[PDB]
Amino acid sequence: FPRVKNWEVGSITYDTLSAQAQQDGPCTPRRCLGSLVFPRPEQLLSQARDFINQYYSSIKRSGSQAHEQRLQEVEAEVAATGTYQLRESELVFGAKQAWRNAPRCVGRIQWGKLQVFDARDCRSAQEMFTYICNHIKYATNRGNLRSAITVFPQRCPGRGDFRIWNSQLVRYAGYRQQDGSVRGDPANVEITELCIQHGWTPGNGRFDVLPLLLQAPDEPPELFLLPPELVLEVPLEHPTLEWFAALGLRWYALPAVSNMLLEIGGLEFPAAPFSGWYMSTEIGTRNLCDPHRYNILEDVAVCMDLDTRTTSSLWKDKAAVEINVAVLHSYQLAKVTIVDHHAATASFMKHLENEQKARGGCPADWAWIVPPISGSLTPVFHQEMVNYFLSPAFRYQPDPW
Amino acid sequence: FPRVKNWEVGSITYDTLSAQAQQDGPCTPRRCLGSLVFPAPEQLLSQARDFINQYYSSIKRSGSQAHEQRLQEVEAEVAATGTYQLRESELVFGAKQAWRNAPRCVGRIQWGKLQVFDARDCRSAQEMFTYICNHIKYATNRGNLRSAITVFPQRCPGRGDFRIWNSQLVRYAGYRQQDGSVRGDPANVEITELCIQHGWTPGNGRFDVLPLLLQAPDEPPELFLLPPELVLEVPLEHPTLEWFAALGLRWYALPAVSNMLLEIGGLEFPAAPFSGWYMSTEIGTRNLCDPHRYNILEDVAVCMDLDTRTTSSLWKDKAAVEINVAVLHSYQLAKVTIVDHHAATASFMKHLENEQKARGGCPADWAWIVPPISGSLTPVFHQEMVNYFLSPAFRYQPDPW
Ligand code: HEM
Ligand code: HEM
Ligand SMILES: Cc1cc(N)nc2cc(-c3ccc4c(c3)CN(C)CCO4)ccc12
Ligand SMILES: Cc1cc(N)nc2cc(-c3ccc4c(c3)CN(C)CCO4)ccc12
Ligand SMILES: C[C@H](O)[C@H](O)[C@H]1CNc2nc(N)[nH]c(=O)c2N1
Ligand SMILES: C[C@H](O)[C@H](O)[C@H]1CNc2nc(N)[nH]c(=O)c2N1
Ligand SMILES: [Cl-]
Ligand SMILES: [Cl-]
Ligand SMILES: [Gd]
Ligand SMILES: [Gd]
Ligand SMILES: [Zn+2]
Description:
Two copies of one chain form a homodimer.
Chain A: E1 3-5, E2 12-14, H1 43-58, H2 65-81, H3 88-100, E3 115-118, H4 125-140, E4 148-151, E5 163-164, E6 174-175, E7 183-184, H5 189-196, E8 212-215, E9 222-224, E10 233-235, E11 250-252, E12 256-257, E13 261-264, E14 267-269, E15 274-275, E16 278-279, H6 280-289, H7 297-303, H8 315-333, E17 338-339, H9 341-359, H10 366-369, E18 393-395
Parallel strand pairs in A: 3-4, 16-17
Antiparallel strand pairs in A: 1-2, 4-15, 5-8, 6-7, 8-9, 10-11, 12-15, 13-14, 13-18
Helix pairs in contact in A: 1-2, 6-8, 7-8
Bound molecules: protoporphyrin IX containing FE (HEM) (2 copies), the ligand Cc1cc(N)nc2cc(-c3ccc4c(c3)CN(C)CCO4)ccc12 (2 copies), 5,6,7,8-tetrahydrobiopterin (H4B) (2 copies), chloride ion (CL) (2 copies), gadolinium atom (2 copies) and zinc ion.
């Protein structure tokens, strides 16, 4: 039972929950690989049994009637058909647990407040798009954001697979050049190549919201132009730097990830887009200041008249902080839900204590919980963490080509 | 072999050096514990044999007459005495390799430029003090800091260890109190109590330099005061916030870690203090802003007239950025060597490139290498790393009391 210390307070806990990890991680006694982003058939019944046992443990209903009975029909369902279908409430319980189990998510204090949209009966790129469009509008909610996941049908052998080709529902274009360099988002130049290579008319500028590439089983993808009224965006202004607005920066309201594979009780949902709301460093620090993203940091420091000739003026740090101030200020002025990294990390420490008494620990990936600016100014920095894989979970999956 | 990606640039390498990992860390395939701070002649023979092979590789004499002679010699001396002695050149090479191998050190671009003082003939605590004073004097060098290590006699059967009880050669007292609060550095309350109970007359300032507690084999520790003019200090001021000088903040020039164990070819040196020069975030962010250290952040933000009643104003990030500016400016004004986190991490990237060519990899602990502020603004943030233990090495050891 791994001993875990908080160095700011001096408190000690034990992660007894780690003793129940499934999928082995990338680390061995000889070398740690925790900093790696992507680490490198009756098996279905073992994972199905275990997920059902989880479900009835939570609702105080282990070791009695419906517990016994629910065990049998999945046995028979797999005996007869080879796969199985989840009860709607089990799908709800599995989705919240996969969120609860995400080691890299700092927002998990919210894990119990999740809206599960069941799309398991879907069957075309036209049905997808409507299900996706109801999500975005419910999730956006005029800027009062609400966490939501939409679950498309559970993959089965012999036939294709529902998949969304974009990494997220809202992405910005990335256009090449005579010189390779990109107008717009460099992280999306590739999926921008597939949209133009499928009928889409390439726009001009930096913040062109890409269309969707939606794929029903076996049939090729189909473009879908998102409605401008459905894609809520926030223009970026600074409370006291009047020229910041003139830089023409924007970001969208809804982070909705659409390339991860939801896995519950041995079943795989390659299309299950989930969404919440942004922590501000995600936008201001990574999306806008990463050298391989919008890379705006030097442009903002010039406007602030900072001395960029020597790193020791800390001009990168000063301009970064102001970009984050502008993100927080702009989202709040537009009445769009956002959380700063101080509030978010303090809530995550509260989640750690909750999960300690409820489950005896919590899988947390230190390198992703600590924010990308001002790390040691937040409490999670001084908190040791244990990382491991619990089920149900969100997994990465290959790109569909 | 582990594949390692840099995400800023897209490059990819394989850490083949990790396969030679001479010991075992705390991670298993079940669970990663990378974020934890604190993770027989036959075996002395094989450790020694491997170090000797390393030494003769570095001087391009592998498998030679002189190489096999030294193996037979070492084996003979372990049989006759249970231990063996390093040649002077072997000691210098082993001390540099220990620095080179240290996974949490961002300063390793410098590893070949290290001054090795051989104090293995030291006989008492009094001589030990003289060796240490000369180390401080050489390393400080009137502000033009030089990297050095002094190595005291190795652990040997029959006699006790040389130990320095202080965790660094220069530290500020931390005086307990009631109302419960610490005056001075709270990290040093325990050593401060030990000094008092060994006959030190305590001051009552916030930056009182502690005496040295030095243990000769099979002797109680002996108190030694450092001559005030040996301990170079830097009063902290800010280039534009003139009230900052009125805080009365100071820090010392020389970071000299004295409580670690140096291991070379199976031999152990429990007393071998080493020093380099500061990276400004260790002082500004950690030593001054950690809530459990000097904890000046809120007092600085109030003075800056920042809005401290809400976190989304990012008052903490703005105050910490100015504390770091003050540190860098104060040290440059005083002509005392200092490196900012941007230059340091950029030189660490060159070290990784050098090391990949030389040894096929480099042990690095991502969470220690990424600075405590402005993490993703530095290039080490976007570099994946492999953490593992090579020997020779600096190891932690328990406190002598
Ligand atoms: C409600 C507010 C939420 C906040 C503030 C939040 C915040 C974050 C942040 C900051 C990250 C890492 C940033 C990065 O990877 O660059 C992350 C990752 C993640 N989040 Fe959350 N999140 C929220 C809701 C959710 C929801 C609703 C789900 C799913 C139902 C979820 C599941 C995940 C997962 C699986 C990851 C891992 C990403 C990966 O491994 O690539 N989160 N979240
Ligand atoms: C010359 C300039 C140097 C710089 C800029 C530097 C930088 C650093 C920094 C920033 C840390 C981590 C501090 C923290 O924990 O917050 C560190 C750790 C460390 N340094 Fe360096 N260092 C230097 C010289 C040296 C030398 C000369 C040695 C040994 C001969 C050394 C050995 C180590 C070791 C062993 C650690 C790990 C400490 C631990 O594991 O607890 N360093 N270094
Ligand atoms: C629900 C939710 C809310 C939120 N606020 N942020 C989220 C961020 C991700 C995310 C997913 C994958 C991923 C990365 C971030 C980052 N790295 C930079 C590269 C690609 O991998 C996923 C879900 C989020
Ligand atoms: C030679 C050298 C130069 C330099 N500039 N810094 C150094 C820092 C350390 C260090 C050693 C141990 C350690 C910590 C830092 C940090 N944490 C805060 C708690 C205790 O563990 C050791 C040697 C350094
Ligand atoms: C190499 C390193 O693991 C990689 O850059 C990680 C670090 N921590 C992160 N943390 C978050 N939240 N998102 C990321 O993309 C990363 N990237
Ligand atoms: C718990 C956490 O791992 C711990 O506070 C670490 C994080 N990274 C660090 N990195 C450095 N350089 N120094 C430190 O003291 C720490 N502390
Ligand atoms: Cl994003
Ligand atoms: Cl220090
Ligand atoms: Gd101007
Ligand atoms: Gd001023
Ligand atoms: Zn690990």
